Amino acid sequence: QISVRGLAGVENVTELKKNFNRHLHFTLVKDRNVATPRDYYFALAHTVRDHLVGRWIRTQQHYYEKDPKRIYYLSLEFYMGRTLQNTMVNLALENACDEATYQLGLDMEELEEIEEDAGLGNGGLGRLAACFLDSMATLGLAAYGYGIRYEFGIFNQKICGGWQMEEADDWLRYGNPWEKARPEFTLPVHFYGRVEHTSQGAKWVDTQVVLAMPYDTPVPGYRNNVVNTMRLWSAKAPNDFNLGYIQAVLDRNLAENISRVLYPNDNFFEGKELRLKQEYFVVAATLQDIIRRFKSSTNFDAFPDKVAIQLNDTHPSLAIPELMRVLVDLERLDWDKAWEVTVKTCAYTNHTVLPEALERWPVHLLETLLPRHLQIIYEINQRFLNRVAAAFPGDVDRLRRMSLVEEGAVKRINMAHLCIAGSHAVNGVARIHSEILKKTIFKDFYELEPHKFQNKTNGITPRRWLVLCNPGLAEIIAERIGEEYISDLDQLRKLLSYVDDEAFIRDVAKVKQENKLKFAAYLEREYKVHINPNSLFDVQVKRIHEYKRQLLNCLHVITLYNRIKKEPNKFVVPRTVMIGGKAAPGYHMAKMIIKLITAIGDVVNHDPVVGDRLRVIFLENYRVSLAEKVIPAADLSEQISTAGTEASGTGNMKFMLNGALTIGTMDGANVEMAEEAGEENFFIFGMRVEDVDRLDQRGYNAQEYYDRIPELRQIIEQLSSGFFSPKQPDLFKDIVNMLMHHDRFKVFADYEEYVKCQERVSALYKNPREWTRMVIRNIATSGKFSSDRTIAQYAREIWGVEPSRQRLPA
Amino acid sequence: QISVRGLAGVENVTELKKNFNRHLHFTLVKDRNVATPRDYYFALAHTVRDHLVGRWIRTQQHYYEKDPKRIYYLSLEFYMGRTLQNTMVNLALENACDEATYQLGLDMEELEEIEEDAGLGNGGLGRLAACFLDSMATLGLAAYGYGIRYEFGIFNQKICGGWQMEEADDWLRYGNPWEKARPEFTLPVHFYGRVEHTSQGAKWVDTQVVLAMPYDTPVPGYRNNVVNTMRLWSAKAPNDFNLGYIQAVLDRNLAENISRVLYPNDNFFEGKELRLKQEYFVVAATLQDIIRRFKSSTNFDAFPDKVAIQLNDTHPSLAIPELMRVLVDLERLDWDKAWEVTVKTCAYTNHTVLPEALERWPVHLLETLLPRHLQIIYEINQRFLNRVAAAFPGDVDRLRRMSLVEEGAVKRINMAHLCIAGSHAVNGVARIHSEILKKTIFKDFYELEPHKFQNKTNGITPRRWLVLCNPGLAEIIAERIGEEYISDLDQLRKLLSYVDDEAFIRDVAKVKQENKLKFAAYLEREYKVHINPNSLFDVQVKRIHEYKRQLLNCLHVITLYNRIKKEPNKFVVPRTVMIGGKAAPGYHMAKMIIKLITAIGDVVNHDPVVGDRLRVIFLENYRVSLAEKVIPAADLSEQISTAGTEASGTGNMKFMLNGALTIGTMDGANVEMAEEAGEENFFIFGMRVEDVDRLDQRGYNAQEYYDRIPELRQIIEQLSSGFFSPKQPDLFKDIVNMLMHHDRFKVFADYEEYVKCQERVSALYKNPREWTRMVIRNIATSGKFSSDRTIAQYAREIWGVEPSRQRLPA
């Protein structure tokens, strides 16, 4: 049908069709008379999957022969989404399969909707891992993703009476065609026990053993015949576990609970034993696998030449003392050499500055669970602090600030300090974030070892986030500049010479309108909601957090409503305001924010004076597959975190690539996005990081804003009095009181400038041609935000490997 | 290589080889350089499996069109063993696969050894279900096996210091190529709750729901292109289960524990809640599936014309009140019509007379777990007892003896009484067992409804139990009489005209010697034990029980040892005495018996005066796959239960088919075996049922035998004094005291006649030619004991269906 989706040759279509029928019969054990759409999806998935295997075997064969330096990307989260379409795209099979299935009397799009999301992450950090794997494969790096195969991923979100309800994400119920179980490569992981000191060093004894069983998932690069591996570990009890009889067998679940469920906290630390077990489990099994692969190439001097370990936040920080444990206790290297090897092998990426998000493990937990690791940590700390003492003599406060061991009520280990001490590189995830790390929370470390500190601005994959979710846009782009930009997103700059091209302007705007129409119909079919596709699509989608300021959006929404009720017969640009996202189950305020959004919708959406001029929709169960639908449909991207709080953001980049304009603060990657596009082409408002600082020093007083802004006062009074909750007038008292007395994120301080900036957005939307020209200038300068760029910088500046765009033989 | 294993045509071998390579590449994701024997086994299993699918789909299609009466065989146990060889045999692929794999440079036999046993049963009752499924498919019946897919089957038995250790049977670890998950056909099962009475009848409300997910396994008939289904249910929690958050997800295991592990009791009742849950789970899910299939053909009058339900013991007895529940509460039939439908649908097979094996569920358990079922049971009981009162007026003691409700400390439900009241047929499993049912434990029921009571003597499948495990014997037989006997075992009678044939005699004896040599080498390879293949192979393999009298065998063994030590230079026929079997984990005496056997071995096997004249081996981890090895190798089958205790036995039949002679009591099927072969051709000894009765009335006094038999006295003194346990002299005091003061099974009473009969066995073995002629007379008269015969009698006399030997189109 469309060019970028590949060729539909006669030989290929015929072949796909017969393999489809073969799988339906032999694999699914069905005939055409009993088969359901789900069966058809599976026959298609197996047919496509077969095309991966040859490439998968030869990629891994190639790495064995050439022996390049291997990259190990360690994360507790891989937010993968669906795999079928992505595989077709990267293998250039999309048109061929579309034809084959059409000829079988099937609609491929309908079959695509059956696949469950692999929801093995919470949000930004998990999705970054998934974009990174895609780019690493596309760039020909010998890269392996390592994590945990959770039986239950992020919960499905139901909205009931305006409240979030959680239900188990049973994503494996029908089976996962994309994973290959590898029980033959099962490895032991040790817990508890005690340390014995002998003639020749320490020994960790009387441990409980949990088995780590790997499941491999293929990761295809873009049209280069490279297929890398994501290896996810699953917990299994040994066969003599607890071995009355019946209970012993039933108690096996105690060990297997390790890989059962993803912790659903975004940017928040919870110090639970099960979470710590998860962190060690992934690290211990992964490191044995790395060492095994290295030995099958005595001399650990070459280890850092053959191995890079990237730590995705502090969650796998135990890799540092675990590598020390293995090198010192088992391989019998001396401490100093082991340490040199570890530092040169490990690198650490920080994803947040929020204090409540930082991992600080109680010492009594590590003592019981990982006694040898605690001893190694103490020894790391002592040797590190001697270096500090020698560099900054007499600075006794620096000693306590930098210690890996924190003093107080309960002693804790600061995992971030551990990572910096044990890594040769530390990076933040956008220029402003990395600067903040050097100036504030890691200042002392930066002064000791300035050479460690780097920036690697985040990116997103243009395969999933343009070609896959927005074929129409990808196609009009390819018509003018070719197909090469898909793996070199910088070529989008060439679109600048089309900014005054009348045909292009029409095409860009036509693609948006079609995406909006398709999304508006999706909303009716699956959720029975009536929206106007001519309105401005104002969207904020991301996890529910106070720092992300969904509440600031709520205040704008109510202001628009109040202004309409004030002057009903005055003209306003119609808006559909969409807010979606999950709240962590224990996060009371986030759950209150969701309830507020639905309550506002309940009033706004049923007021006859408003008409179809303002709609407020809560997008239930926001996840990767929903993002692929709503992002192409958006006109306005809401990126409105308090300056200094959002480390980077990646949702922002997605919207930029797909033809939305951005309203946002100078936070995270927003700064670099506006710098690339030009500030005139961005809707920037609000305090900068410097303004926030000034306000903190003086003291933030919310009452001041309330007193001086009548429109704001009215909203607070509406909230307090029960305007949005007639039956429970006090429902939102917690929200009001937080806003008035304990707002860490200064929602009121940005309100006036936000409302003003929102008026300027509305003015620009009244002029379709100029709106679209600004869109073209955004799309055209979004190239920097490809994860291919990000990964090439990791490769060159951290891992010491050269990327390659060269094909492997087919 | 050999005739009965089918043709190895050029087209077929070529095809198998390429499908083997296709699976290795696409299915296993391996190449020949990294593949292990386990991978090769899997490629073979998938290749063979493909041949089932077409036949499987058309068999089930055929049943849909023809709509025959369906047979549902309900069991908590299906002891299947391995499936690969069985499938090759029934599909006539064995030689072709042997050739194909040979040409690939592989040994098929070695690949066969990799497959795990499906160990989903304890012993006789479970293996009977598996033989029955095979015969039902071979006879073209529309039959379905229904049970539970246990995650852990019967435990693996390790012997450590002479003691049994249990370890989890993790049979699914590498995956099961033979099952197809059918998540689309998942069904709800209800537990707990309470009964509400409304205008229109009772309603069972506030229940907890557990999901039943089916897994289908193909069951091929012998060379007739019939493939039936065994459907096993697996327990799954619903997605809103318990829905802090993390705990709720982890507590899902509480629901899923239902299908976790097989209860490992043979012929013994344990009244545990989890066991009851298992029994209801299988019944509730199965019955919904039956009713669904019946409706997809309003009028339940035709239900018994279209459905037979066979209850394998009382374990699925809850089918009776569950069918009543569904018909009365949900379909709104009146009681009397529902009851008529139930009786005509259900039939009950009894497998034991032992009182401790009978299920008697406490009322307080059913009250909490299944409140509606208890009410229905009470109502069944009341209406049943009114029939008894009307037939036997004034017989008040008959009323209390026959009640389904037992009075006393705790009120209990007698599940056996439930089954008889609610079934149109009740059968025992051998003629003497069925007679015992009518004369003793079910006398009152027999007097009320004589027409209900039947016999169906057990049988074994000649596919697994001759062709598969003993190809050499199957081949020399087929050379003389053709191949037709494999599905008509009565044709073996024709071998009687070969009893004086010198060529045959030589061939029969040659096959045994080769089986003994192969087994002797197996013992060295896997267990490092030195046995003499010229000795008589004296074997007792079965579950360890006091009623099976492994202890009587032990006494003989010690007697032989003492006689040798007494007269060392006297000649005795050399024996290898093999005893194997598992003890239930809670069964202290059974575990002591195992320890005794190994202790005897420790003394006997290392005494230089004995030499290779007597060896005592405990066969560790006895299971279906081990039975297939040891049975073909046996010379003497030990079938020595106290008369009246072994309902049938099936191991006995296996040995008879494979050329062992039988030493045994007139118990269970032994009576019919000796009747078929002639008593002159059987080594019968001991009390008959009548002699046991006489002894009970007088009072069994073990001291009397001890006083009058010096050889027996010596053994007891050796046991008491610590001869077989020098370091712990009192180790066996529990055994001695049981034998002397509380022996329910009268071991001493049969000792003298057993020893005497054992001398006569030894005399016959001294004359090879006459031993072998007696063997031929046994093999030749074993036809009655084919499960094809058994199933044809069930079909004609209970189910009301005609078997058929006709092929379906290929």
Ligand SMILES: O=[N+]([O-])c1ccccc1/C=N/NC(=S)N[C@@H]1O[C@H](CO)[C@@H](O)[C@H](O)[C@H]1O
């Ligand atoms: O991971 N993959 O996407 C992929 C690509 C191509 C072929 C198989 C796979 C994954 N297979 N994963 C699994 S668990 N395969 C399993 O392999 C077993 C024997 O090892 C077979 O019994 C099963 O038929 C198959 O499901």
Ligand SMILES: O=[N+]([O-])c1ccccc1/C=N/NC(=S)N[C@@H]1O[C@H](CO)[C@@H](O)[C@H](O)[C@H]1O
């Ligand atoms: O990964 N997590 O969601 C998680 C689980 C449990 C405890 C802390 C966390 C921390 N999450 N931190 C996250 S999502 N940080 C996010 O990372 C993205 C990728 O670089 C950035 O673009 C965002 O600015 C940042 O907030």
Ligand SMILES: O=[N+]([O-])c1ccccc1/C=N/NC(=S)N[C@@H]1O[C@H](CO)[C@@H](O)[C@H](O)[C@H]1O
């Ligand atoms: O039951 N069988 O013996 C049998 C005969 C022929 C083909 C498949 C089977 C059993 N397959 N059992 C299972 S769980 N197959 C599964 O089917 C899934 C889709 O439904 C696929 O994702 C997997 O590749 C496959 O393992």
Ligand SMILES: O=[N+]([O-])c1ccccc1/C=N/NC(=S)N[C@@H]1O[C@H](CO)[C@@H](O)[C@H](O)[C@H]1O
């Ligand atoms: O099936 N079980 O092993 C079980 C588990 C839990 C409680 C009672 C039992 C009862 N088992 N009863 C058994 S094995 N009876 C056996 O059935 C065979 C087949 O007809 C007969 O040949 C045997 O004579 C009989 O003992």
